[PDB]
């Protein structure tokens with residue numbers, strides 16, 4: 001196929017894609033059967049399922065041309081922040097959009113924006129933190145004044161690529177649509193910057209305290225401000241959903257991010273940086289740092305999300321608690337979480 005699917009596993013892929021609308025889709029199998037084109041292959045599936053191609057007159061050719069281009073701007077050598085992660089965040093956002101509490105809430109344009117935002121949110125990620133780029137006086141850091149450095153970059157590159165030959169998937173939108181989508185996308189990607197987590201969660205907390213549903217139990221959002229707030233927390237949840245997938249999947253994610261963190265530690269050493277060495281793979285405690293990560297970041301976010309969508313996210317929340325318990329059981333320089341927390345300042 002134009003996708004990279006051999007006639008061999010075209011049945012394998014279709015069977016894996018039967019769970020396109022599920023939390024337990026396995027995005028790794030999708031990349032195996034697509035020749036490492038998971039982002040393009042899953043985005044195509046998502047757009048078909050939602051009938052977004054026809055709603056917005058994005059021809060297949062334009063969509064595939066843009067997606068394929070987008071996906072090549074992810075770096076396959078970066079262990080976690082590659083096209084598989086982006087594939088996963090998009091597939092995950094696709095599911096969160098369809099939870100019954102969010103049944104008919106969002107316009108097609110809002111759905112288009114959320115999922116697009118998920119696909120581009122990490123494009124051209126060099127595999128290092130914002131703070132690394134800051135401390136090295138990276139051109140990117142200078143360009144965005146050390147503020148949401150990479151998040152700004154992802155947005156820049158994701159829009160830039162619309163301009164390549166037959167890559168403008170938004171060309172048949174009206175001016176008004178394009179301006180609304182853009183503003184929403186910008187707002188969701190910047191919302192994936194971790195130093196904004198706590199302020200993000202502090203507003204989601206509020207939203208829940210005065211939430212209303214229809215007689216159908218569909219959450220009620222009557223002005224742009226509310227919808228974009230839900231949308232941006234949705235994307236950030238998606239971004240932080242690894243620990244809520246099946247233990248088998250979660251551990252693969254953790255393995256990947258730890259490789260990327262350690263690979264960052266090697267660059268810090270190599271380049272002789274700021275005397276404050278992070279722990280290496282012998283000296284770190286990865287398990288302890290996970291439980292630290294889930295208690296401090298992941299669970300408080302997911303618990304508040306589950307509140308908003310009561311009881312839609314319960315199986316998610318229970319799987320989170322099971323996984324926290326598994327990492328918990330496996331527990332025996334500046335540590336991972338110490339380095340994480342210190343660099344929020």
Ligand SMILES: CC(C)(C)NC(=O)Cc1ccc(Nc2nc(-c3ccccc3)nc3c2S(=O)(=O)CCC3)cc1
Pocket residue numbers: 129194239240241242243250253254257261289290293336337339340343
């Ligand atoms: C901590 C440094 C290295 C400075 N990095 C950052 O601030 C950027 C950053 C990038 C990704 C994460 N995302 C993740 N971060 C962690 C983690 C964070 C701090 C201490 C120990 C672990 N674990 C996981 C993830 S994940 O859900 O992606 C995969 C599953 C486990 C957090 C932060």
Ligand SMILES: [Ca+2]
Pocket residue numbers: 121122150192193
């Ligand atoms: Ca990011």
Ligand SMILES: [Zn+2]
Pocket residue numbers: 085089121122192239
């Ligand atoms: Zn991400």
